[PDB]
Structures are given as C-alpha cells and as structure tokens.
Paper text:
Here, we report cryo-EM structures of human H1-containing tetranucleosome arrays with four physiologically relevant NRLs. The structures show a zig-zag arrangement of nucleosomes, with nucleosomes 1 and 3 forming a stack. H1 binding to stacked nucleosomes depends on the NRL, whereas H1 always binds to the non-stacked nucleosomes 2 and 4. H1 contacts DNA with L1, the amino-terminal part of α2 together with L3, and α3 to stabilize the nucleosome and contribute to chromatin compaction.
Numbering used by the authors:
A (entry chain G), F (entry chain C), J (entry chain Q): 10 to 118
B (entry chain A), H (entry chain E): 37 to 133
C (entry chain H), E (entry chain D), I (entry chain R): 30 to 124
D (entry chain B), G (entry chain F): 20 to 102
The structure:
DNA sequence: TATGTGACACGTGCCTGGAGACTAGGGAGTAATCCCCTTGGCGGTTAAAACGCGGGGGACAGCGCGTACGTGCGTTTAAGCGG
DNA sequence: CGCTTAAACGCACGTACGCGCTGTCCCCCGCGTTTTAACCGCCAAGGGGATTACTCCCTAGTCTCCAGGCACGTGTCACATAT
C-alpha cells in the first residue's frame, strides 16, 4: 500500500541527513525554493570536509599516542595545514592553545 | 654557590611549556569578578552562565595571544627581544583597532 | 518532561568510525566540531542566498552550492569537494 | 557587589604567562597596564554586544550563545559552546 | 525605452536640499551614496534576520532593528539613530 | 470609495520610500513576516545617517569653496569622523584619494 | 592571442606615485618586484572569484557588478560601482 | 647653476601632491593587459566591462596604498625611513594574509 | 560480420571525464589501461582464489578481496582503496 | 509485474560494470561461489586506482601542454609514484620511454 | 609503572521529523533578437617610462652602558574546591 | 563558609639589551635626456546581454505513516595522577 521508508542520505549514499539539511535550509530563509540536489551536494561537501579533518585529527592523536581526539589535537591539525589555516585564519578554538613555535633570534647563541 | 639559570633559559622552558599546555593563564575568580564589574556598568545586576564567562575567557586570551605574536613580530622587526607598549599600539593600529 | 535538542553527534561519530575505527573522541571536541559544521553551513547557505539574489533566482540549486564551494573553499578542498559532490548528485540522480 | 579596580585582578604574572604562551621573551614593565587597557577595551566591546543581545533576548542573565554571536559579530569566531 | 531600474537619486536629492539647499551633487557621488545606503540596508537586514532566528521569530519587527542599529553604529550615531527612528515610528503610529 | 493614496514616508515625515524598503525586505528574504514599523524605523535611521554624511560633505565642499559635492569631499568627510571611520574602516570609496597625513618623523627639522 | 608579461606594466614610477600617496618618503630598489608579486596575489584572488561569478552568471563578459560582489566577499567593499 | 633640490624634499612635495590628488596612478591599458592576462589564466578569451577595469584599478590602488601606510608605520616603528620588502611581508603577516 | 570483443574503454572514459573533463585520451593509452585493469583483475582474482584455498573457504567474500588488496597494493593506495571499497560495500548493503 | 532493471553498478554508484566483473569471476575459476559484495569491492578499488593514475596522467599532460594523454605521460606518471613504481617495477609500457635520469659523475666538472 | 575514574561510549524508548504519494503552477530552461556594448585596429603626441650621473642621507655594524627585567627565594593571601 | 595550599608579591642581585653615538659605505631620489607607447579619438564590426515569449520540471506543500536520533541510563577502561 505504501513504499518502505528509505532515506535520501542513502539515496545519495551519504551519511549526513538530507532531510535535516533540507529542513534547515528551508527554515534558514535563503530562497523560497531550493533545488533538490543542493542540500544533497551540501551534505556531501560537509561530509567530505568533516571526514578529512577527522583523519587529520586522527594522525595528530596517533602522533601524540592518545586514542581520543582532543581540541589540542584539533588545534595542532588545523594550524599545521596552510590550506585549512587560510580557511580558518580568523577562527579560534576553546582550550586549543597555539602551535609550538619560536623565533630563531629568541633561541640562544 | 646555589644553582641559577641565566636569563632566558627559564623563559624558554616556560614558553615551551605554555605552548604545549592548554590550561588557563588567568585566575578564574578575579576574571569573573572583572566581567561582572564591566557588565554592571552597562546593565545592572547581570547574572552569568559560567560557560559564558569561560567563552568570554578563551575569546579574551585568544585575542591577547594573537596580539602577542604580532608584538613579537614587531619586536624582531625592530631587532629587539624586549617588547614595549608601542609595539602593541602598532599591532592594534595596523590591524585597525 | 524536557525538550529534545539537535546535534551532529551520531553522524560525526559514525564518520569518525569509517575514517578511523580505533580513534576515540572527547565531548568538547565534538562541541567544537558542531560549531565548525554549523559555521560552514550558514557560510555556504548565505553565499547561496546572495548568489540566488544576484542572478534573481528564487531557487537555489546545486550549481549555486558548487559556486559557493569554489568561492569560500580555496585550492584543493574545493575541487575534491566538487568531485565527490557531483558524484553524489549522480548518486541521488540514480535514485 | 560594587566593584572597583578588578582590571588589576588580572595579575602581572598572568600577563607574563600570556606572553610566554605567545613566546614573548622579554616583557617591559610598561606592558602590563597598557595591555590591561587594551583588553579592557576589547572586553567592553564584546560585553556591550552580548548585553545588547541579552536585553533584546528578554533575559536578565547572560548566556554563552549571545557571547558567541558577539564574537562572530566581531570577526573573532570561537568554537565549542553550542554555537 | 527600456525597463525601469531602481535608484535612490531623488531621495538623496531631497535629503540634500533638506541639509544644504545651496550646494549641488555629482551623479557619481549619487552612485556612491546609493552603494552606501544599499550596503547599510543589507547589513541591518542581515543582523535583523540573524536576531529573528536567535529568538526564533517568524516576524521581523522594529525592536531588533533598534538592537541591530545599536549594535553596528558606534555611540552617538546609535543613540541619535534610535532617536530619529523612534520619532518617526511614533509619528507613523499617530498616522 | 478609496481614500486619497497617501504616502507612508510623509506619514512618518520622512524622505526615504517606506514602501520600497518594505518591498525590499519582503523580497530580500530575511523573514517571511515584517512588522509594520520596522521599515519605517529603518528608513528613519537611514535618513539620519544620509543626512549627517551629506551635511559633512556639504561642509567639506564649502571648505574647498566648491558648490557641488565631490567624492574627494566624501572621503574627507567619512575618514575625519571617528564614529564613521570605525563604522566603515573596511569600506573604500572610488576616487576618494587619501587623507592628508605625513608622519612627524617624515617631517624635516 | 595569449599574453606573457604585463606585470611589468605596473612600472616603477607608478609604484613611486602610489608610495608617495601612501606617504612613503624613501623606497628601496627591492620594493617594486615584491609589490608586483603582492599586487599579483591580491588581483588573482579577487579575479578568481569574479570569474566564478561570471560563469555562475552564465556570461562570458566580465561585469563590474560581479567585481563588487567579489571585493565585498573579501571584506574589501568598494563604493562607486554598486549598481 | 642648475638648481638641485636636496633629497626627500621633492619626495615630500610628491606626498603632499598625491595625497591631495584623487586620480588613479596606474596606466590604464597596461593594467587592462595584466587583468586580461590573469583572466585567461582562469578562463581564456573573456570580455570585460571597462567599469570593471577601473573598479579593479581603484581597489588595487587603495589596497596598495593602505599596505604602504602599514609598511611606513612598520619602518618608522623600526626607527627607519627607508622601507624594505621585509616590512611589507611583516605587514601582510600582521593583516593575516 | 564480426564478433563482439570486451573492452574497459568506456568506463575509463566516464572516470576520465569525472576526474578531468578537460583532458583527452589516445587510444593506445586506453589499451594500456585495458592491460592494466586486466592484469590487476587476475592478480587479485588469483590472490582471492589461493587465499580461499588456504582457509579452505569455497566462497570468496569482500573480506577475502580486502585481504588480497591489502597484500598486493602497498599502504597509502591500499588504505584509500580500502576506504573506497568499504564505503562502496556499505552503500551497496543499503542498496 | 516487474520493476525497471537498475544496475548493480548504479547500486554501488560506480562506473565499472559489476555484472561484467561478476561474470568474469564466475568464468575465471577462482571459487565455486563468490560473495556479492566482493566484485563491488573490486570495481571500487579498480576505479580508485584508475582515478588516481588518471589524475597523474592528466597532470603530466597539462605539464606537457597536451590535451590527450600519451604513453610517455603514463611512463612519467607511473615511475614517479613510489607505490605505483614499486607496484609495477617489472611491468613494461608500450612506447613509454624512460625517466630523464643522469648520474652526477656523468655531468662535466 | 601502579591505580582510580568518570567520561566516553553504547543499549533503549520514542515521537517526531523525515520520507512516500500526488499536484499546481510557476520559476526556470530555452529560442530569438538586436543593439549596444565590446572588441579590433589606425594615426599623433606627448607624458610617461626609462636610463644615466651624482651625491647626499640613511642603514646598519660596532661598542659600550646602565639599567631593568630575569632569576631566585621567602611570604601572604587569595584563588580554589566541597558543601 | 571553611579550609588549603599556589602563586602573587616582593626584594635583591646580576646580566644583557635597548639604545645612544658614530664610522662608514652604499642606495636611491633629483635632474636631465631619450624613447615609447598611452591615450585620444575615431571608426568598423560583431557578439552576446538582455529582452520577450513559451512551454514545462520540479518542488513546495499536504496527508500518512514510520524509524532515527537524541534523551536516558549505565558500564568501564583511557587517561589523569603519583612516583
């Protein structure tokens, strides 16, 4: 009588929710209509970015031998990528700290 | 004679420590008291989420520390290792504060 | 009786498990990631809104989103995102 | 209740800690009060914004969501408080 | 002829003659002022939209317009903009 | 049986078009509903701002004995006000020139 | 058809004029090429986005209104060309 | 004797003149050549409104001039009057670029 | 009358325009890709068969071929191939 | 009666033919049964590796200012990726040529 | 390397938000056109750029110097934690 | 409010560092001359921006129904802490 429920995220093959992003865009008042592929594309883009920053955080954690992601590792991952640094040059992170960085003249001899 | 490090060695060690460390460089209670002091001037009897005070905190020293590498770049531009408040003034004004 | 609140927790935790099955998470790092994902969401959405205004379109399509990616995201992240997202457009187009 | 000079409640060694996290080697004695004034200006900007949000919000107490709105108003976005 | 294109030239000229009947205007300065008023308009509209979603408000009203102009305009500009707007709101309230 | 079509700018004693601004807000997609006094308040704020900047421009043109306002006069007006410059530091005017500014160290003995 | 060298079209006396407008009293000989590179970076950053507008506008002619959009995207809003 | 002004005097007079002046200091058609050259590096054989060319010229000259005031502030902050490109790089790093 | 002969040309063409719309291809380079996909195909296929013999498993599953591609392909290419195949088999599991 | 036939290549959403690969593994004598997801995995990893080598080839062709890829581009691409090179050290390419490589002592002075 | 622990992480109820079916219509894709805007090119001219000489002003190294933070140790108290 | 130390203060002595001065060398603007191409300005051409029409693709919206993700509870081991 009715088709079985199948998510549009799986229709994209994506993990971020297509219906939730579509609802946020509709209620976020950006245009009175929206293309169907637009929130799918959007959720795909954010899933790609979330994925890649998640491997970068994983490598930062593994280099510092901690199994769990810490905002220090997020800071160290985000500042050591010049691409991501230019993405977020004005973005601050709570309890993030800075890069360990010294000037050469500040070092002795 | 007792042990005594030459100038800059303890400074280097604490620079490396606080670069590695992430915990707060401000005593929390006088910071919160100062926030209440400033906020009372604009609206009376202002109450605070502690998380709001904390977010104000990391915003504050993030701004300060960024201004501090700006000051350090100004100082190494001026061939110096001792900073002066005119360096901070230069950094603010070139940023446009 | 307390109201439900929206989060990205299950999705980020799953995609963490595909990118790194053995790697954990701290909760305030998830708060930071929530702030990032939301922040980029309204960045792209505001770009889409103004680009829809500039061409006088009342409908925002995937072309607008892709243009916003090319504008805000620089360099390689833009083109990899374009590749995977256009791939995703075909994937939903098949459905 | 009534508060007077808590700008000096931010101690000089705290300012030295802040400089060392920024990797500053040598700090003048003139630095601390000038930086206190600078941070005072910065804080009064952001708390003016956050307050203005708060009386618009019809809340008497400041919330952190107003705070993060104030910081992104100033181009100083901060992550990790439910924003 | 062609389709009508919107401009703010006549209102700029009327306000100019309110403040300076004696002087003239260049049309390039008129275009600069059009850019000015459009820029300030879209700014205020943007933060009004933000504040409407912050309080989850389906209607944008004058109180958050007041909030936004107090937010952007520094000091003396903000209070006298509030004064002028409140005066005009009262006069339209009295029709 | 319609009454005389009267204008809301005159109702608020204003110059700026209330109806056009309300139309722009309804079609600029900031909310689906707009309070009636909001475009009036906005137009009045804009009228105050335009009035003061044009007054400063007329003052600057009078200072340079010029009877028609100039973008150079606009630059000199907008940059010599502290509140306006902090309002519009990142905004540039075409053909404005720059402020007359020479550092004292640049100045000779 | 193609072009190979027009960055040198921003000549040294033009840089001197801009520096005197900038209030620079003395200009090194090393300045001009580095300013050419920095100017090149700024112009390519704005014109990439202006292009992206222009094919997103489905045009092959570059319009100034897209230049305004791109400049105000990067926090460099210019008055005198809007509309 | 053919008169020769002492150095920097004509430079300061140029500073006064070009602060007084409002016009563009870049040759228009070489600027258009460079604009089209960089345009084909993104998309070849486009057309241009001249208004776009003057808009880019205004924005470029304004950005350059403001960069030179920042450079001048850095140089006098380093107790010098002669600027070097290190000062420009410093100012760009302060601006977050 | 001729006989139909298999090639991997058209799928390489879809992939090529997916990854580089601006880039053409010569037909003998297409043949080199054909040799590539064939050679790697029976490399992996024999690996899967002999692994299936080692554990006396008469059915080759995705675990087996994942093991085999981890054996032959080194590291970075291996782990990103693992990622591609893993998300592919999960979306097929949903399919 | 019957739904529209939708391919398993579409079900994965990948370009390589799932049915052809499954048919080849059935007629290539590797096991008496094969899991359904295994040829999907095969097509995925093959399309990943073809995608990366096609990135390399397109980059080399654009370096050589050629629109269409040639076996020289293939040689230069496959020899300069260490995982690909040590993957294919004993694999020879038709008309590939060699890497430009000169020993230091072959150079004069 | 030894030891607690609470924070991360995972099983569970649910309702609610998101998907399925269907439609109106309308914004959007597309065809045509034309004309105006944009490109292409040709002659005069001079300012604009470029180049050379020069000569002073400035950058910067060297050296010292006195002081003003760095470092070290004793104290207070005041920050900090529990309730 | 009630303990409870950590660090903030504070003094004290020492070094190193901004800075002051000068020697010195070299760099770059002042000026004049040469070139040159920028620019007016004029005109031809054509190209696509924009405009109007036309028909249609989707999608926003409505009603139904259901499963997903978050609240809720819990347990448990990676990490904090100590040495």
């Amino acid at each position: 009588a009715r088709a079985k429920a199948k998510t549009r995220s799986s229709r994209a093959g994506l993990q971020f929710p297509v219906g939730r992003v579509h609802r946020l865009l509709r209620k976020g008042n950006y245009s009175e209509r929206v293309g169907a592929g637009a929130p799918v594309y959007l959720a795909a883009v954010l899933e790609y970015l979330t994925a890649e920053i998640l491997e970068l955080a994983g490598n930062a954690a593994r280099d510092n031998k901690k199994t769990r992601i810490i905002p220090r590792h997020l800071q160290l991952a985000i500042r050591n990528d010049e691409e991501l640094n230019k993405l977020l040059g004005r973005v601050t992170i709570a309890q993030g700290g800075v890069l360990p960085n010294i000037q050469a003249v500040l070092l002795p001899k | 004679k007792p042990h005594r490090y030459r100038p800059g060695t303890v400074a280097l060690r604490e620079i490396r420590r606080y670069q590695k460390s992430t915990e707060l460089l401000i005593r929390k209670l006088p910071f919160q008291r100062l926030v209440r002091e400033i906020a009372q001037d604009f609206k009376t009897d202002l109450r605070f989420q502690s998380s709001a005070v904390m977010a104000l905190q990391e915003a504050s020293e993030a701004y300060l520390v960024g201004l501090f590498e700006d000051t350090n770049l100004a100082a190494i531009h001026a061939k110096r290792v001792t900073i002066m408040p005119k360096d901070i003034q230069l950094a603010r004004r070139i940023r446009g504060e | 009786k307390r109201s439900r609140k929206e989060s990205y927790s299950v999705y980020v935790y799953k995609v963490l498990k595909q990118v790194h099955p053995d790697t954990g998470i701290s909760s305030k790092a998830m708060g930071i990631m929530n702030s990032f994902v939301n922040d980029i969401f309204e960045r792209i959405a505001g770009e889409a809104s103004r680009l829809a205004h500039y061409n006088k379109r009342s409908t925002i399509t995937s072309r607008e989103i892709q243009t916003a990616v090319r504008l805000l995201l620089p360099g390689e992240l833009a083109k990899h995102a374009v590749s995977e997202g256009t791939k995703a457009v075909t994937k939903y187009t098949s459905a | 209740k009534v508060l007077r000079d808590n700008i000096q409640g931010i101690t000089k060694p705290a300012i030295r800690r802040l400089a060392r996290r920024g990797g500053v080697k040598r700090i003048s004695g003139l630095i601390y009060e000038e930086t206190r004034g600078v941070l005072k200006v910065f804080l009064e900007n952001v708390i003016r914004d956050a307050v203005t949000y708060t009386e618009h919000a019809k809340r008497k107490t400041v919330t952190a969501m107003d705070v993060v709105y104030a910081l992104k108003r100033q181009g100083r976005t901060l992550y990790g408080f439910g924003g």
